[PDB]
Amino acid sequence: SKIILIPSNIPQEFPEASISNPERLRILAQVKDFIPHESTIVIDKVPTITSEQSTYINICIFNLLEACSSRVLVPGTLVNIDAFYDGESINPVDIYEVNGANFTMENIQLIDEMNNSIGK
Amino acid sequence: LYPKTKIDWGPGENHICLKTPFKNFYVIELFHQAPTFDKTIPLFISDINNSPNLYGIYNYIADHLRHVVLVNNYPVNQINIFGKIVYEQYKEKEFNGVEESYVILVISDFIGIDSKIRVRLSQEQFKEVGLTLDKKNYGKIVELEGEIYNWYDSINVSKKPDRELKVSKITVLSHRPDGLHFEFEQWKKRMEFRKNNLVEPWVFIPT
């Protein structure tokens, strides 16, 4: 149970994921590009968030097109991606645009805490 | 100097139920003294689900604590949670001229392990908040207040119980998919509250 701000860090975050034990995820990223002939969106960390290295990753959302809003395919759009990572590929179950005002220093730090400080 | 209330809870460590190398679980008689009791506090679903099986701390006393959960060592009576609707089920039991319809949802605030909890509400409360009976409310963010029932297992004392929130009040924070700002608002509130009131264990000291 984690919110990913750095898409390319997913495999490092869940080295044990697999089809037998997938990992539920939530990605907040910026769409850099969309490859129409392959129904693939290229995403990356939302810019101003961190200085940590990051690399674009390509998610095939072919099985989401019909239900998806077109806006989520426009490069520049900030999005939320709910998906299951099986250790090799990403299986998206939902995706929608999110407002840029949400990415403040305060909320980013809030996300860090909620990813480690829970359980007395 | 101002008046200092006093009540005798008996001799010695009588008011203390279980001593822990970290905190003390006090007897039920003291629950009303907790700054947490009888007040609707905003919690993280995870903190509720990670709540300990009370039979392993209060024995036969737990028979009367099904409606209570200890967050850290604070007894919670009234609960306030928020999250996305991840599951919908409509039920229509039949009685004497009485058709009572209800809704059962699973809400997820999503942070920590086991951040999902079953919630029960009447159809009236569901519809009056704008939720439709068409199974199309997935994703919506809600805020709920209510009483919780825990099926604490007296025999398997350490086992976590199945739980359910009886909703006394529901508010739809966002009918739209993008309610990210509402989640940051809710998450923040519950984090701040958890820091200032729950992280440091409750310590009860006489006058």
Side-chain angles (χ1 to χ4, degrees):
Chain A
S1 296
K2 288 182 184 173
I3 291 184
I4 290 74
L5 295 176
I6 300 179
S8 53
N9 280 1
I10 291 179
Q12 290 64 55
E13 294 293 312
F14 309 100
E16 247 62 72
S18 72
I19 295 184
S20 302
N21 305 291
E23 220 64 65
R24 252 298 321 214
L25 291 187
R26 198 166 154 81
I27 307 168
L28 291 186
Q30 174 189 68
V31 173
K32 294 290 185 185
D33 204 347
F34 173 57
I35 302 177
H37 51 288
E38 291 183 9
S39 310
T40 300
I41 47 173
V42 182
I43 63 172
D44 195 41
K45 61 172 179 170
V46 178
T48 75
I49 281 181
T50 179
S51 49
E52 193 182 322
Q53 184 179 296
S54 183
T55 294
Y56 302 175
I57 69 164
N58 315 306
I59 305 177
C60 176
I61 48 69
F62 181 59
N63 291 302
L64 283 188
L65 294 178
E66 185 182 3
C68 281
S69 162
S70 294
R71 184 60 190 180
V72 98
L73 309 173
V74 179
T77 302
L78 298 178
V79 304
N80 165 281
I81 301 163
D82 286 302
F84 282 93
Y85 170 57
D86 58 43
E88 186 174 68
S89 49
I90 293 176
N91 304 291
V93 300
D94 185 37
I95 177 173
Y96 54 80
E97 183 180 7
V98 291
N99 196 281
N102 288 303
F103 304 80
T104 54
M105 191 61 85
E106 303 63 60
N107 292 336
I108 300 302
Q109 298 194 300
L110 206 194
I111 286 177
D112 198 311
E113 304 192 63
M114 301 197 289
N115 281 322
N116 65 296
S117 56
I118 305 289
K120 307 129 193 313
Chain B
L1 300 187
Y2 305 72
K4 309 175 183 181
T5 307
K6 182 57 186 178
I7 307 175
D8 65 296
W9 325 79
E13 309 295 62
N14 190 191
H15 56 88
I16 294 181
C17 175
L18 187 85
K19 302 72 177 181
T20 289
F22 300 84
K23 64 287 183 64
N24 297 312
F25 292 78
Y26 304 93
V27 298
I28 50 178
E29 305 108 67
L30 284 173
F31 284 7
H32 71 278
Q33 290 296 309
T36 284
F37 221 65
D38 278 69
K39 203 225 297 172
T40 309
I41 54 173
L43 296 166
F44 278 118
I45 293 176
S46 182
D47 282 326
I48 295 176
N49 285 318
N50 283 339
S51 201
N53 172 159
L54 301 188
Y55 280 94
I57 310 176
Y58 295 84
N59 304 297
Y60 71 95
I61 298 293
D63 284 351
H64 308 286
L65 302 175
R66 297 313 185 75
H67 67 304
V68 172
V69 298
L70 286 167
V71 170
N72 193 343
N73 74 330
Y74 293 78
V76 178
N77 198 61
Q78 288 156 41
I79 292 174
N80 171 298
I81 58 174
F82 100 105
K84 292 185 174 180
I85 295 177
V86 147
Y87 178 72
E88 288 179 79
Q89 193 188 309
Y90 308 154
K91 288 186 173 179
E92 304 181 2
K93 295 188 174 69
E94 61 185 67
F95 304 108
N96 180 184
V98 189
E99 305 295 64
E100 292 177 1
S101 301
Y102 297 85
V103 178
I104 286 174
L105 309 166
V106 175
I107 281 53
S108 176
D109 62 354
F110 196 77
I111 75 173
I113 312 299
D114 206 331
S115 67
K116 307 192 194 312
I117 188 157
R118 188 171 67 262
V119 156
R120 195 155 63 64
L121 178 82
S122 71
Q123 267 181 38
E124 298 165 292
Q125 314 170 80
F126 183 88
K127 289 156 54 192
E128 299 198 320
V129 81
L131 299 175
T132 55
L133 291 166
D134 61 338
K135 253 66 145 47
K136 300 181 181 178
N137 300 289
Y138 174 90
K140 299 179 178 182
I141 301 79
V142 295
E143 180 166 44
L144 317 172
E145 301 195 324
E147 292 179 358
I148 183 175
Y149 187 81
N150 299 278
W151 278 271
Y152 291 134
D153 192 311
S154 58
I155 290 181
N156 296 72
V157 159
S158 65
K159 194 173 179 186
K160 283 298 187 292
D162 171 36
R163 321 181 190 253
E164 179 182 67
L165 180 63
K166 311 289 185 184
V167 186
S168 65
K169 184 192 180 184
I170 178 171
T171 305
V172 170
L173 299 182
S174 171
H175 281 280
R176 302 295 155 270
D178 172 25
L180 186 51
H181 43 297
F182 292 106
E183 306 182 77
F184 276 123
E185 190 175 292
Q186 289 302 319
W187 287 327
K188 192 166 298 176
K189 180 171 70 173
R190 335 233 151 197
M191 250 309 267
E192 286 181 52
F193 186 91
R194 181 171 164 156
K195 289 180 174 179
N196 311 324
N197 316 277
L198 309 182
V199 180
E200 295 182 299
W202 172 41
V203 179
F204 189 69
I205 285 185
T207 53

